[PDB]
Scaffold this active site. Sequence first.
Site, mmCIF file in Angstrom:
data_model
loop_
_atom_site.group_PDB
_atom_site.id
_atom_site.type_symbol
_atom_site.label_atom_id
_atom_site.label_comp_id
_atom_site.label_asym_id
_atom_site.label_seq_id
_atom_site.Cartn_x
_atom_site.Cartn_y
_atom_site.Cartn_z
ATOM 1 N N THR A 1 -15.720 7.436 -25.021
ATOM 2 C CA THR A 1 -15.498 8.314 -23.876
ATOM 3 C C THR A 1 -14.123 8.966 -23.934
ATOM 4 O O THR A 1 -13.927 10.064 -23.399
ATOM 5 C CB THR A 1 -15.669 7.541 -22.570
ATOM 6 N N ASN B 1 2.758 -0.345 -23.501
ATOM 7 C CA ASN B 1 2.621 0.752 -22.547
ATOM 8 C C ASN B 1 3.931 1.037 -21.824
ATOM 9 O O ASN B 1 4.137 2.143 -21.314
ATOM 10 C CB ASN B 1 1.518 0.438 -21.539
ATOM 11 N N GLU C 1 9.414 25.023 -22.834
ATOM 12 C CA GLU C 1 10.368 25.154 -23.926
ATOM 13 C C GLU C 1 9.918 24.447 -25.200
ATOM 14 O O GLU C 1 10.618 24.524 -26.216
ATOM 15 C CB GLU C 1 11.736 24.621 -23.498
ATOM 16 N N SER D 1 -7.253 7.532 -25.637
ATOM 17 C CA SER D 1 -7.425 6.729 -26.839
ATOM 18 C C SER D 1 -8.543 7.344 -27.670
ATOM 19 O O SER D 1 -9.716 7.282 -27.284
ATOM 20 C CB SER D 1 -7.745 5.282 -26.478
ATOM 21 N N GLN E 1 -10.193 3.739 -21.443
ATOM 22 C CA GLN E 1 -9.486 2.522 -21.056
ATOM 23 C C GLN E 1 -8.027 2.576 -21.488
ATOM 24 O O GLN E 1 -7.135 2.158 -20.741
ATOM 25 C CB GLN E 1 -10.175 1.295 -21.649
ATOM 26 N N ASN F 1 -0.672 2.427 -32.784
ATOM 27 C CA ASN F 1 -0.351 1.131 -32.198
ATOM 28 C C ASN F 1 0.522 0.259 -33.091
ATOM 29 O O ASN F 1 1.525 -0.287 -32.621
ATOM 30 C CB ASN F 1 -1.639 0.379 -31.855
HETATM 31 N N1 LIG Z 1 -1.747 1.804 -27.437
HETATM 32 C C1 LIG Z 1 -2.789 1.390 -26.723
HETATM 33 N N2 LIG Z 1 -4.070 1.582 -27.199
HETATM 34 C C2 LIG Z 1 -5.136 1.163 -26.476
HETATM 35 C C3 LIG Z 1 -4.950 0.539 -25.253
HETATM 36 N N3 LIG Z 1 -6.164 0.230 -24.752
HETATM 37 C C4 LIG Z 1 -7.108 0.643 -25.625
HETATM 38 N N4 LIG Z 1 -6.488 1.214 -26.703
HETATM 39 C C5 LIG Z 1 -7.153 1.809 -27.876
HETATM 40 O O1 LIG Z 1 -8.464 2.199 -27.523
HETATM 41 C C6 LIG Z 1 -9.370 1.916 -28.567
HETATM 42 C C7 LIG Z 1 -10.745 1.567 -28.007
HETATM 43 O O2 LIG Z 1 -11.034 2.333 -26.857
HETATM 44 P P1 LIG Z 1 -10.714 1.730 -25.400
HETATM 45 O O3 LIG Z 1 -9.447 2.335 -24.851
HETATM 46 O O4 LIG Z 1 -10.618 0.226 -25.477
HETATM 47 O O5 LIG Z 1 -11.956 2.153 -24.475
HETATM 48 P P2 LIG Z 1 -12.382 3.697 -24.355
HETATM 49 O O6 LIG Z 1 -11.280 4.593 -24.864
HETATM 50 O O7 LIG Z 1 -12.705 3.996 -22.914
HETATM 51 O O8 LIG Z 1 -13.704 3.837 -25.261
HETATM 52 P P3 LIG Z 1 -15.029 2.998 -24.907
HETATM 53 O O9 LIG Z 1 -14.737 1.534 -25.128
HETATM 54 O O10 LIG Z 1 -16.162 3.434 -25.802
HETATM 55 O O11 LIG Z 1 -15.399 3.221 -23.461
HETATM 56 C C8 LIG Z 1 -8.761 0.760 -29.341
HETATM 57 O O12 LIG Z 1 -8.923 0.959 -30.724
HETATM 58 C C9 LIG Z 1 -7.288 0.783 -28.989
HETATM 59 O O13 LIG Z 1 -6.538 1.187 -30.108
HETATM 60 C C10 LIG Z 1 -3.666 0.343 -24.769
HETATM 61 O O14 LIG Z 1 -3.494 -0.209 -23.685
HETATM 62 N N5 LIG Z 1 -2.585 0.771 -25.508
HETATM 63 MG MG LIG Z 2 -13.750 1.959 -23.233
#
Ligand SMILES: Nc1nc2c(ncn2[C@@H]2O[C@H](COP(=O)(O)OP(=O)(O)OP(=O)(O)O)[C@@H](O)[C@H]2O)c(=O)[nH]1
Ligand SMILES: [Mg+2]
EC number: 3.6.5.-
Lengths: 430, 439, 432, 51, 206, 202
Positions: free
Chosen positions: B145, B228, B254, B140, B11, B206
Amino acid sequence: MREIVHIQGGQCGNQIGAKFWEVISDEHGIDPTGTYHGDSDLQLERINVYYNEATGGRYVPRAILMDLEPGTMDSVRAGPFGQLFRPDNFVFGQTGAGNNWAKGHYTEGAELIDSVLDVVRKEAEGCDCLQGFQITHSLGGGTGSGMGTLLISKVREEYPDRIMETFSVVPSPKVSDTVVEPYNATLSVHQLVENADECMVIDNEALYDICFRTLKLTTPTYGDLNHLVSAAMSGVTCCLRFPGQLNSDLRKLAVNLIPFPRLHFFMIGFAPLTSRGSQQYRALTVPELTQQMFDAKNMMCAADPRHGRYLTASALFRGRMSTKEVDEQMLNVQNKNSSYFVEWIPNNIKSSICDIPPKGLKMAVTFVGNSTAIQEMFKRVAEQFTAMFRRKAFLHWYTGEGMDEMEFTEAESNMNDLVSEYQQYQDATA
Amino acid sequence: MREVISIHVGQGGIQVGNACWELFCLEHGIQPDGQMPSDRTIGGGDDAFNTFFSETGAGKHVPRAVFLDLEPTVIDEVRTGTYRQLFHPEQLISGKEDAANNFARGHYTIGKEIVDLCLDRIRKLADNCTGLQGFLVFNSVGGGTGSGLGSLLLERLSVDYGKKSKLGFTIYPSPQVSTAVVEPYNSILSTHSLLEHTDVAVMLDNEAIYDICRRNLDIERPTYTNLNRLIAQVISSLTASLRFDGALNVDITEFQTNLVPYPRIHFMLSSYAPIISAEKAYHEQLSVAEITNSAFEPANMMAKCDPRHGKYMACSMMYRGDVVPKDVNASIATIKTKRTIQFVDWCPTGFKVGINYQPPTVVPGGDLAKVMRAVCMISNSTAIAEVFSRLDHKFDLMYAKRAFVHWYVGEGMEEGEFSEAREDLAALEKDYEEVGIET
Amino acid sequence: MREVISIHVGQGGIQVGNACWELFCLEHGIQPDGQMPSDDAFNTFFSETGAGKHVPRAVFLDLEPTVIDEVRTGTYRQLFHPEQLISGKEDAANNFARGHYTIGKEIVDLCLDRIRKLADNCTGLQGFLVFNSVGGGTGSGLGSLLLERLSVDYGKKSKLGFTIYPSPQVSTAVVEPYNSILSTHSLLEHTDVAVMLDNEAIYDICRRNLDIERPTYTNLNRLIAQVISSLTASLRFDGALNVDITEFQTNLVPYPRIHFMLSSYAPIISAEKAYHEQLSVAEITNSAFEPANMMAKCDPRHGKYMACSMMYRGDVVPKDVNASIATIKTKRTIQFVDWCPTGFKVGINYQPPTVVPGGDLAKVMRAVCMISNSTAIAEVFSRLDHKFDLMYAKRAFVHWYVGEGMEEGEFSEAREDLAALEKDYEEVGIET
Amino acid sequence: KNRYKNVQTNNEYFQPTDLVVGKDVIINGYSFRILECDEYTLKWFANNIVQ
Amino acid sequence: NTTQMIPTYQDVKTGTTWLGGPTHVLQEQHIPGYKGHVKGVQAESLHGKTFARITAECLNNRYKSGFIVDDEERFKTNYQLEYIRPNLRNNNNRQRDDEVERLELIKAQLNSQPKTIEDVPPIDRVPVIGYQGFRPVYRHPLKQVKGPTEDEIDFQARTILELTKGQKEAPKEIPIVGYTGFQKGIKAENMFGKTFKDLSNASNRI
Amino acid sequence: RKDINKMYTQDQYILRFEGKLISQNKEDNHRKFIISFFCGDDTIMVYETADKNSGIWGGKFLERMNHNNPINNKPYTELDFQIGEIIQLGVYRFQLLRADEYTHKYMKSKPEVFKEADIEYTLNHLRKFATKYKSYDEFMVLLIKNIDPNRRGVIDFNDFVVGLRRLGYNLTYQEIYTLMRYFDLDENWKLDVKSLFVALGG
Ligand SMILES: Nc1nc2c(ncn2[C@@H]2O[C@H](COP(=O)(O)OP(=O)(O)OP(=O)(O)O)[C@@H](O)[C@H]2O)c(=O)[nH]1
Ligand SMILES: [Mg+2]
Ligand SMILES: Nc1nc2c(ncn2[C@@H]2O[C@H](COP(=O)(O)OP(=O)(O)OP(=O)(O)O)[C@@H](O)[C@H]2O)c(=O)[nH]1
Ligand SMILES: Nc1nc2c(ncn2[C@@H]2O[C@H](COP(=O)(O)OP(=O)(O)O)[C@@H](O)[C@H]2O)c(=O)[nH]1
Ligand SMILES: [Mg+2]
């Protein structure tokens, strides 16, 4: 995709299910005739989670209403949104259990479950990608506690990997309405712990406490109590039905909340709650939402969390809000009250954001927390049970239906063992 | 004739990738539907979009990106948005069951049934390209995942293409404020997989970006969308030299030829300056001399690591706008003279300087103002050894009592994988103190 | 000056020939009634009446009235010749014995009557096209009788059969393993080129490319008609490299017993996402050689390739064709048999593939039709033999065959022929 | 047995005069038509509604 | 709300402010750091849209208030609320109007030659020579054809001209391929073989 | 010092033209060019398009820079970049044939600077010349007879310009284009003389 079918049993279960389906139907804009009348496209975005489609463009919930007496269903059917339910899904006996566990667990439930197991398998087989099951019942009545649990045991055998949810209404000690509360409640928990993936504890005494003092209502009814429960139950699966900043389905809550397999008893609380007179004086910001999240009187259990320490906690926010404020407050509360949080697992609070708030509200709260202070429930239930069992009170009814007094013993010990090890982590240090 | 392929998982990967592509479309004049405008009837000029886009022969362009995830809710929102007509329909791969913050589920149970589809899709994108520079990945690491498929894809991509360059942009969990509770496990297990399989990695913690927005942009209630847009700005300045003419060109190749002294040490942390709001952007001259001072200012670090606690290995920075090479050299001389910033003993020269002519673009509905000068910097330092120390502290706490281990054992991952993951982190740390000592 | 005669026997044959002839009619610009709208090349498939309508060079055979009946009440009733739509009264009832020994024997005479009358008009006859479903009664038995008679009745004329074999696990009938083996044994020494179009593969191809999740038989026949048009466009449209029917069996048939081969077509893209890619000639051949895109349920990755035949049509360039061939040869996962250093035959035509209005496919300026022969084909024969051996072991469904003139020991010799074919296929695939 | 809102009159509660035989009526999103009434009501209607 | 309506088209062209813009002449701000009440910051929990724009929102009274949300503005997610194209700098696809009228052109053309009222040739009045069938003896030998009437053909033709550069609109606009929503009764009424892109139209048209 | 204010407020406006090179060599009497004008800092880029199967190595011809006209020794401005003019960039002379649609909107949207691009000025320019002739009515009949030899009703550009040159009236190539494009009813670039007569007077 990830749809779930609804399973609910007993008159306590049926009255809760009636209010819950009304709330969801109003949330998705479904009329009492079962025809969509909404305005936004997102209301029909993910309706397959709960509603099945039939010819003519009408929707029918995938719920199974199950009981041992036809009186309750003949009442719940005529209620508002009661015409939605498919008449085939109704299954009832002709004798009843009579608040006896053995009648609902050995004699009548055993022969009746063949029919109800057929309809639920049809519902599960139809959906392409089943997510899991959820339960709603009470542990104080034999029909609810006996055939409800035996249903759980059988279904777990056929779908061992699918997630499973259970809402339990355990009998509170003060407002107690039957004499056989300790017997069936103790025995049901023994089967409940081995099979249920998650358990939510709901006490009618706590609901009475919240309504009288928070909402300040002189004369509430069971409808008001059922309204509060349905609000929280919809919150858990809400972000599964709507897009949001951070997704969180049922499986995510389980893994992030229970550190060990045999510790899956929770307590829930819903925010914000305000009386009509004080409704126009408050301000809906994150600090007020999170301050009522953890407040003792808002819990849906009679167990006070300040008598123990939280193991893990979770929160589900509904609406549009800044992420930084959400995460900032979680760190804030976790620091000022370090006495109430276990130390060997840092950052033991989870957060989620859903963009669609409940109808009539701007921001919402759904809290689910695993705390070691709920053991006092089993401790007090144990002492009434041993008061019952030492004098062999009301036993000839239970032992006269194919079971011996031995099965009472290990269930007492297994529940006794549960309390000891559940208390072990309270004083554990790293 | 030079192309790069972007990979997004999780995500966090999709949301970051979404902000990047709106910048790229606006930067090259792409309308959301694909045609440039409906107004321009000339076309056929200054082909620079080939780096990110690909012509269909007559009309619209298709980005060279892939979207990967296991819950369809985030991807479905893309398909119903205003950008539905841009991406190819069958490169937004979506799963059925989410990993649910479980590394084992996303590595051994579910990811196997979906990794095949991506590699088939990736092979079709690579065959179209002729001068493919390398792959970019966004993930992330705190999600199941994100680290699950990311571990699997990088392992498979290592043998399918071999020496082809792969660049990593991880988002490590914050030291004290976190989303989930089980993040130390899947984050630590990810490091072992990506340590020997990625070429360059960048930390994008973050809370560091939260500090930047509050202090500089003056936002008191930011959300992930504001963040973002800053990372999207970093990507723009990172690959601008590929498609825009400048005084000094610095390509993708490079970086893995100038920034990593040793194969094990390829973890770096970045900075961006200036970051200033429109109402106070015009109250100062934004001279090139002072913008490069802000980049080295540890308060504007984009990772929660203080370089003052360690030594500098190498520093790569790219300029864009109307900078003058002699002004750039003048400011670098001051930085070396500055005593509070020290370099490692065996690195007498440690600067790589790139200059580009195109000024950064301004996005309507955005937060930054438009300026004639900007600098993006990538630094390698021994100060990155502290983040693994605190992760080791947190990981060991609840692994002493074997918390949550049943959530991983029963999905096919054997118990011994935790022990080897811990040892590699300890060995990885010991490398950092060994290098940082003087002769 | 070149002519080809089409034979449609069995319900599958008629239902695929309907699509084939609709496609041909649209491609050549004739109205459904047969009268040209006042507009030589079409002489390969049609025949002028001197002035007026045109008659397709096809004959429809069946033993059941209803399927032919729709042909005479549909929009193409006035096209075909009235007594070339031969239909019987009683059916084969999935009994290969009935369609080869009892009721099919008394119609083949009139079939050959019509064939002789059609061929006598023809002066430069190239070869015969035969359509039949193998998993059926009269599709197999009557087809076997027709091929056996036509071989001796026409000598060395080339005959192409685009048979339909039963799918490995998805099936309709229950005795179709029985009649498939006998039909295969009959046609093995009587057909020159056979192409396999089992149904299960087309379902996956449709679901994966055309984005249809609930297809019907109308969709499948359109793809087969497109394949026929791509194969035979060189006989009626000029191009850079023209190939006749006769220069197939001289190239794709290493040995006389080995003439079973499988086809592939690309691109097949729906109009929703057809304009998202340029459809370069370099990438259409990759889709053609994709193992999942094979029109038969077989995996070419499990065996060696013998020879590959290519048909490019549209605006392809000869230089661009050869680069793709070189790239495929350099690729490692695709390997050829040892004794075949050169293994491609290429064809280029100028006429773009036609599009049916209101249809499924979009319109593209480039397309390729691939015909390949490989050692991987032994899997279908092996599984068919296994299925038959499971059934014949305790002599099930045998009285429905033995009572119609079929000798008891006829199954054993068909099994022996299948075993010999398997032995040949394994000995060809060994390295010298 | 409950009190029901009436959409036909400003979301007000039902009144005995609302139920008129021969004329349709709306209850809880359903449309009913009244065919005949018990003559006990007819005596009640004649004695109390006539004003 | 300020992010899309301020720097209007009139002000950006031959005006004081560009896209970035020091837009303090046009409206009212509070120069970042400022201590005081804003009447709309703490009450509404406004997020993003840096302080300069937040004050401009409250000062110019576009605003919103109240616990109760009136349906329409309740049902907006963060994605489409913010990523609504570029708006104000200088002033979508024409498709789904052409596709529908290509579809109707085939339907109108198909209905244009049904051989109405004895325009059939002398042949085909009776069925084909060898027809099988029944051929009842007590029935009129020659077939009877009704065919569509003239105004129905003219009815279709009016919409074709009307739809092209007229009052009628594109039907609904739809998602592309893998959208996993309900799709409004694709399963209830089978609609099996109609090319999901096309299947979306028929189900959504109703 | 550099003019930042002009850079900020006029960065987005980019003028794109199509042109053909005028030179001694017969080598390059056919190949086409695309000319881009960035008015942010008066910067001109010339691009050279290449046809397929042509054998020419197309690409960037002149990179963007700022350079002035040699005759008056003044920098080029957007006023000088009007369609039909000949622009000399160093030692290369380009003839502007056609302009982009967005460019045409830009010039028409901004009057009092591109006077030849404003229709009522062009009509006033043409009409005002009737002072030398004896009567207004005989001016019309003389014009139509001169412009149209066989009075067909729709004429071409070449016929239109040659007739005006025959009359002796000096119209710049820009104004001739302005009138021609306006009076095209169905957009095929054939003048409608009847509407021209009505516009002049009826
Ligand atoms: N900097 C930033 N971090 C994000 C963002 N969205 C999610 N995260 C990070 O992602 C972590 C959780 O995972 P998610 O991205 O929400 O979902 P995922 O990576 O698909 O993992 P699952 O929920 O198990 O499917 C959080 O601790 C956030 O720190 C974002 O838009 N910007
Ligand atoms: Mg997720
Ligand atoms: N590709 C394709 N195959 C078809 C079609 N219709 C029938 N078949 C195949 O034909 C086989 C059975 O034979 P039929 O087509 O029903 O008719 P038949 O071959 O003459 O056999 P009988 O019905 O006994 O006379 C089935 O297993 C199908 O696989 C069709 O429309 N398209
Ligand atoms: N929340 C809630 N609890 C109820 C309701 N009705 C009954 N209960 C609880 O259910 C318990 C008794 O349930 P019981 O009648 O035995 O259900 P049974 O098992 O189906 O027979 C009491 O302790 C009540 O507190 C209701 O409508 N709402
Ligand atoms: Mg048949």
